[model samples]
Target: SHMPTSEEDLCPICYAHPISAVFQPCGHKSCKACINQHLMNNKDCFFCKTTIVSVEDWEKG
Candidate 1:
């Protein structure tokens, strides 16, 4: 999330990737999909570095 480039519409935390998950537990609401995946399998906030709730109901349909 600390890069100096020309990518604006993409995920600010990950280059060339769209905002995939809304992490309401942290200031960075929307993060990369990869981060979201890891969060579920690990139960920790990617940015906040804390345990997360609402982990199993983000993309359910």
Candidate 2:
């Protein structure tokens, strides 16, 4: 197994998987699976508490 050296290397929501998506408007990154589940209910950034209206697949960038 691998370990994360910094917060940026891990999903803020799951604290496990690597960041795979970016929440639009605020531009915060999180794991795709994690954020999808989160947005299904909250619709807000788990870090800054900003309203998350959309997201972009970071892997596509």
Q: What overall lDDT goes with each candidate model?
A: 0.55, 0.77
Best-fitting candidate, scored by TM-score: 2
lDDT of 2: 0.77
Q: Runs in model 2 with CA error above 4 Å? A: 1-4
Instruction: Please state the error at residue 29 of candidate 2 in Å.
Output: 0.5
lDDT of 1: 0.55
Residue 11 of model 1, lDDT score: 60
Model 2: colliding residue pairs: none
Cα shift from native, residue 16, model 1 (Å) = 1.4
Instruction: List, in order, the clash count of every candidate structure.
Output: 0, 0
Candidate 1 lDDT, tens digit per residue, 1-61? Answer: 4765635545655667655465555534444565656755786666676765554224423
TM-score of structure candidate 1: 0.48
For residues 12-60, write the lDDT of model 2, one tens digit per residue: 4466677888888889888889776886688888879898788888773
